[PDB]
Amino acid sequence: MVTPREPKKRTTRKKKDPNAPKRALSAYMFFANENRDIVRSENPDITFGQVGKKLGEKWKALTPEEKQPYEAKAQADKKRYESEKELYNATLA
Numbered sequence: 001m002v003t004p005r006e007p008k009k010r011t012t013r014k015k016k017d018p019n020a021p022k023r024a025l026s027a028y029m030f031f032a033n034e035n036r037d038i039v040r041s042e043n044p045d046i047t048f049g050q051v052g053k054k055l056g057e058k059w060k061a062l063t064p065e066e067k068q069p070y071e072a073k074a075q076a077d078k079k080r081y082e083s084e085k086e087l088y089n090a091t092l093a
Contacts, residue, residue: 020088024081027071028059
């Protein structure tokens, strides 16, 4: 009579790099890097797989009040990201 079907799956990861700047962590990484244990401390049974995919809810829930100073900080790292970039290029000069 009827019987639909259509799975889905995919995953690809590899390749590495030297002392190169990922891309200047995001204001999120800053708050997470610190709020990466606050949650892990409440869910030590889980991993970043769900922890790092949960903090995103707190970051956004951190309101513009908490993201105000936080993000404002990532606004400076924009330069710091050049510190690790100077070396990266220094390797390919």
